[PDB]
Design a protein around this ligand. Structure first.
Ligand SMILES: *[C@@H]1O[C@H](CO[C@@H]2O[C@@H](C)[C@@H](O)[C@@H](O)[C@@H]2O)[C@@H](O[C@@H]2O[C@H](CO)[C@@H](O[C@@H]3O[C@H](CO)[C@@H](O)[C@H](O)[C@@H]3O)[C@H](O)[C@H]2NC(C)=O)[C@H](O)[C@H]1NC(C)=O
Ligand SMILES: *[C@@H]1O[C@H](CO[C@@H]2O[C@@H](C)[C@@H](O)[C@@H](O)[C@@H]2O)[C@@H](O[C@@H]2O[C@H](CO)[C@@H](O)[C@H](O)[C@H]2NC(C)=O)[C@H](O)[C@H]1NC(C)=O
Ligand SMILES: *[C@@H]1O[C@H](CO[C@@H]2O[C@@H](C)[C@@H](O)[C@@H](O)[C@@H]2O)[C@@H](O[C@@H]2O[C@H](CO)[C@@H](O)[C@H](O)[C@H]2NC(C)=O)[C@H](O)[C@H]1NC(C)=O
Ligand code: X93
Ligand code: X93
Ligand SMILES: *[C@@H]1O[C@H](CO)[C@@H](O[C@@H]2O[C@H](CO)[C@@H](O)[C@H](O)[C@H]2NC(C)=O)[C@H](O)[C@H]1NC(C)=O
Ligand SMILES: *[C@@H]1O[C@H](CO[C@@H]2O[C@@H](C)[C@@H](O)[C@@H](O)[C@@H]2O)[C@@H](O)[C@H](O)[C@H]1NC(C)=O
Ligand code: CA
Ligand code: CA
Ligand code: CA
Ligand code: CL
Ligand code: CL
Ligand code: ZN
Ligand code: ZN
Lengths: 604, 603
């Protein structure tokens, strides 16, 4: 480690710790920058040379984290907890968690190589007969094809191509991660990930939320299953069994917005999927980011700086180059460079994803002047919820009208049910998946799910929560969890479940602050500088204060609460219940063993 | 209740509590007697009258615990914790746990009635094609038929006939039981059941034990699956998938000794299943119990008293009267009456069941002069292990020879493998099932497994631990867990897993104390008065002391330990590994979704 980057001496006391943290910050920005830079270079241009570079950068970071980690231990191990300065106890608390830097060098190199090989396998996998990529080709098939055999080929192809080769690496990664975090005092890596919510009752709290939300999901599921039955027939849809996992518009069945056209309650009201209009009008990626931005400035939040426009990758490269297409928002930790990397497609759901990603950037712009260790959301779920909250306003028929995407206006009970159903396809359908992913991963980290049951336990959870089944037989040579980006890329998931609850609490609060007094689901906070100021206080706080207190200042309550979500959706919750009873549906999937047959001429 | 049964007044201090506890136990014997008495009259004679009587007694019993529980909290709720006398602290801890008695009266009724209907449904269910009962007909089919289609009909018949009508009742029971135990401070009934082991780390401890044992089970499974493939063929056995749940000798696939004849590793040697010889020689139920008894008296433990021989039901009644055939051992809490109720069949596995049950009685005889509250095992696993320990000695080829059931065996490597394999079929195969039943039930009690997932979670666990699959499609109308006796009869199961480890610890201790020095698996403690004396000390102690301390005095360690089991089985564990490698077996069942097809014209 360069001399300039190494820790000096500090007193063993709180005044030393303050100088320590200032010295650290000087040197940490340079180290975070080189690492983020090498990551960007690789992810926007996957080559062996760029992967070698990212590996060395990652090793440099570990070296740093180890020297500054062991020094912070040596000097403040038994005294940091008693520091008067709360921001300082959290900075110190971060620095002395070494993570992967606890590993000896050989294992550190093995760890860094595993992350790089898993990322590469996921982001370069293809399905062939001439080969389809995930983004855009398979994405578009899952979204728009309504042919059982085509969707299946895409589903199976992807899960096989991405999952099967990840499995040996994922096992090795899991052992090393655990070894690393056990030397910071955690039983396993999952315990460390959960520690970020600083709540003793986290798992119980999540479970109590899910119990309130589950009836919504059960009713949506049944109603969608019925619409699937009418299209696909009795051979492929069991009205008392799980839904085949390739029919819901998305590779993971995680959001069902793309089958909206098959399930829309009242088809001669306004068409609320404005994708056709966007194409018809000639929208491109950069227009989508510009329109997101202008929402932010309408609140008196910050525009995207020049560095963002010059550096970002907003379209899939046409010049050959392999890239990681999975959308992401990047802080370079130099207070100057912030970028998005997205293989943006011109669709309504991508407009929402553009807002999601820009919400990440906006957080990074607002907390850029905190110490590096406090440059995070009050919890991870808060960072995931910012962009989603604005997208709630953008999605409204009134807002869409204002931005020229929805010529007709209507305010009647049918249009409202259409809108809430569309939104339930996006938000309610995701809840089970949001919850289950890290239940899977927590079991893997703890050792409850060994390699020999990775796929068995995955599908147990998928059926248990989402009420889906795999459309072809799977066995333990398959590694279907590995066909979802966040598993190989080691990104936690429970943030998204937290986010899907939190965003409705935020929405309700920002709507009331804006002076809005109509139904919660028709609120649009566009141009509300009051709403703006309230959101700004959250974004500026970073992780400098407990998330419970930041939440309480924002929404007046110190806990996750499903009530705002339930309220937003109440009309469609009631409507779906009534429809399902009148149709005589079975709620749930009591034929839990059922799987559909193979199509007759498959795949030939 | 009667006034003479309702509590006195007592000072709020340790001296009061000593008198209190004495006054409690005097009155509780009378109350336990009439309860157990009515239960007996019902189980050997299922009618509505007998059910009504049992219900009354249960109500009376709740009334008792109510009053005595109220009084114990009222008098000592703060202070009992700081009593010097540990034995007293345990008695008072128990008294203020009210259970079902926390229930309001109407729900007391309701709970008492669902038990009766669930018991009845299980024990009177039949399979018709002239109708087959579980015991003996379906038991015998599962044991000895080698026709895929007959076994299937029996398996599906039973699961459907018993399971399906239990489900609505089981749901109501579960809610009532949870409500009861929440008022004593347990999150749920499962947490109460588990409190019996007085161990913060119980669940972790069980899991750590299962991890050491699991390789043994995996090697046995693969070896047996291979044997079944040779027999049934590739259509019905997947060499990389779970074994169809009807093929292993038992309705629940829980122990596999009855397919021994199909898997025996060196077949030409003497037949270590002495069933043929027992029938040839004209053995009957009575003889089986008399031979068991005499093993106990060889140790200078107690003979069965006259009241046991006069009162017991040791055969299935031929008047036809509905009975609960499931074998059980009965303490009447009067220090006089002790009985077994068993529909005894003349087989070698029943001879072990006879010893198992007689182990319960021996316990009850040895602690009959204790305060009722100490009249249980040091933990429930202790009680389940006693008769099993003696049965391990009885099952040895040398012991069998001594009681005229087998010609002398050659003491060579092959006869040893044969024997250890038979014993693995009985003991190792049981381990997963022993562990999973209460995993299922704890999930139901905690709310993790709602009615809408009773069968899904059941089969998850079955496949996860036993590596079996249902041979016909099941859905949530089926309630396959209800087709196992202990579920409708609300009897915990984890005691059997604990027992199956404990028994090997005991066996090693008793063998060392007998002065035996050969292999663990060839020991016979028959006629060792020293071994007998050591077991007597355990049995006399009841639950007067922490099971950890009782165990330490007996065996040297203060915890459950798989090492004695591993050592008993070492030779066959090594052999099974080698067989499996040479056949190129896959250990486990990676084709986890696999289920067999239906046979051609079924039914
Ligand atoms: C779409 O339509 C709803 C319904 O509007 C109401 O019912 C219709 C059937 C007609 O009778 C309308 O005249 C009638 O307003 C609109 O929601 C309603 O908006 C108004 C405010 O804009 C709400 O009233 C306010 O109530 C607050 C206190 O809550 C008072 O302080 C205010 O003075 C004010 O009167 C009204 O409660 C609300 N109704 C519901 C069910 O929430 C909605 O605004 C309209 N939406 C769009 C997008 O135009
Ligand atoms: C596990 O499955 C693989 C993949 O086979 C496919 O998935 C199976 C679960 C089942 O649906 C099969 O019909 C599918 O072919 C099995 O390996 C393949 O086996 C096929 C056919 O048996 C064979 O032709 C291929 O070479 C194998 N590979 C591929 C690319 O399909 C595997 O044997 C199953 N069991 C185990 C333990 O992995
Ligand atoms: C049976 O023979 C063993 C010795 O032979 C070995 O172990 C057998 C179990 C069998 O598997 C053979 O093929 C083996 O070659 C006797 O064991 C010894 O006994 C003495 C006396 O206690 C003891 O000191 C030794 O340690 C024992 N050795 C072993 C192998 O543990 C065993 O006692 C014999 N018993 C009978 C029934 O004849
Ligand atoms: C597109 C989005 N991408 C993620 C990218 C996260 C990431 C972390 C670290 C290194 C690299 C990438 C994000 O921006 O949070 C995403 O994966 N998801 C999740 C998904 O698509 O699975 C859940 C989605 C909820 C709605 C908004 C988009 C959310
Ligand atoms: C036959 C035996 N019957 C049980 C009877 C239990 C019982 C408790 C309360 C009221 C009524 C019955 C017993 O003696 O533990 C039994 O069920 N099993 C269990 C079973 O057969 O499922 C597990 C067996 C392990 C070896 C010994 C026999 C064990
Ligand atoms: C992708 O990254 C590669 C590194 O693998 C970049 O390669 C450098 O590019 C130019 C010519 O292509 C040379 O001057 C360098 O010496 C290259 N290095 C190697 C190892 O070839 C490449 O330019 C990148 N592509 C883009 C468009 O950024
Ligand atoms: C549950 O299953 C019942 C019995 O048959 C089983 O399922 C049918 C569909 C066949 O596949 C058969 O081989 C199985 O053992 C059905 O009658 C019943 O409708 C099923 N569904 C429900 C909701 O109970
Ligand atoms: Ca779409
Ligand atoms: Ca989508
Ligand atoms: Ca048997
Ligand atoms: Cl997270
Ligand atoms: Cl128990
Ligand atoms: Zn995000
Ligand atoms: Zn027993």
């Amino acid at each position: 480690l360069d001399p300039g980057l190494q820790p000096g001496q500090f007193s063993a006391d709180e005044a030393g710790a303050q100088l320590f943290a200032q010295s650290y910050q000087s040197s940490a920005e340079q180290v975070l920058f080189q690492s983020v830079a090498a990551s960007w270079a690789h992810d926007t241009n996957i080559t062996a040379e760029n992967a070698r570079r990212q590996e060395e950068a990652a090793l440099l970071s570990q070296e740093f984290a180890e020297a500054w980690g062991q020094k912070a231990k040596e000097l403040y191990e038994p005294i940091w907890q008693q520091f008067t300065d709360p921001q300082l106890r959290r900075i110190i608390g971060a620095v002395r968690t070494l993570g992967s830097a606890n590993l000896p060098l050989a294992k550190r190199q093995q760890y860094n190589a595993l992350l790089s090989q898993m990322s590469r396998i996921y982001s370069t996998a293809k399905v062939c007969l001439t080969c389809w990529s995930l983004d855009p080709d398979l994405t578009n098939i899952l979204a728009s094809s309504r042919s059982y055999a085509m969707l299946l080929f895409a589903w199976e192809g992807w899960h096989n191509a991405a999952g099967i080769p990840l499995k040996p690496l994922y096992e090795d990664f899991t052992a090393l991660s655990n070894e690393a975090y056990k030397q910071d005092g955690f039983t396993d890596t999952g315990a460390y990930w959960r520690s970020w919510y600083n709540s003793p009752t986290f798992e119980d709290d999540l479970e109590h939320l899910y119990q309130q939300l589950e009836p919504l999901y059960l009713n949506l599921h049944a109603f969608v299953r019925r619409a699937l039955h009418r299209r696909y027939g009795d051979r492929y849809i069991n009205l008392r069994g799980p839904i085949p996992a390739h029919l819901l518009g998305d590779m993971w069945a995680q959001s069902w917005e793309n089958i909206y056209d098959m399930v829309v309650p009242f088809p001669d009201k306004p068409n609320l999927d404005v994708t056709s209009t966007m194409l018809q009008q000639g929208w491109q990626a950069t227009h989508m980011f510009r329109v997101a931005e202008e929402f932010f400035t309408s609140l008196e939040l910050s525009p995207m700086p020049p560095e963002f426009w010059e550096g970002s990758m907003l379209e899939k490269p046409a010049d050959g180059r392999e890239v990681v297409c999975h959308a992401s928002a990047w802080d370079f930790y130099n207070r100057k460079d912030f970028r998005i990397k997205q293989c943006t497609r011109v669709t309504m759901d991508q407009l929402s994803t553009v807002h999601h990603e820009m919400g990440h950037i906006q957080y990074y712009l607002q907390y850029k002047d905190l110490p590096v260790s406090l440059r995070r959301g009050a919890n991870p779920g808060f960072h995931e919820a910012i962009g989603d909250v604005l997208a709630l306003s953008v999605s409204t028929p009134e807002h869409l009208h204002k931005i020229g995407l929805l010529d007709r206006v209507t305010n009647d009970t049918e249009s409202d049910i259409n809108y809430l159903l569309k939104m339930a396809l996006e938000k309610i359908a995701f809840l089970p998946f949001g919850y289950l992913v890290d239940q899977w991963r927590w079991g893997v980290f703890s050792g409850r799910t060994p390699p020999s049951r990775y796929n068995f336990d995955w599908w147990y959870l998928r059926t248990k929560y989402q009420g889906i089944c795999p459309p072809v037989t799977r066995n333990e040579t398959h590694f279907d969890a590995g066909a979802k980006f966040h598993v190989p890329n080691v990104t936690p998931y429970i943030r998204y479940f937290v986010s899907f609850v939190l965003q409705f609490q935020f929405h309700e609060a920002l709507c009331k602050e804006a002076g809005y007094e109509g139904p919660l689901h028709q609120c649009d906070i566009y141009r509300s500088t009051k709403a703006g100021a309230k959101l700004r206080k959250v974004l500026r706080a970073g992780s400098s204060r407990p998330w419970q207190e930041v939440l309480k200042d924002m929404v007046g309550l110190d806990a996750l609460d499903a009530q705002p979500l339930l309220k937003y959706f109440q009309l469609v919750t009631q409507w779906l219940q009534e429809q399902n009873q009148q149709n005589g549906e079975v709620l749930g999937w009591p034929e839990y063993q059922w799987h559909p047959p193979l199509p007759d001429n498959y795949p030939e």
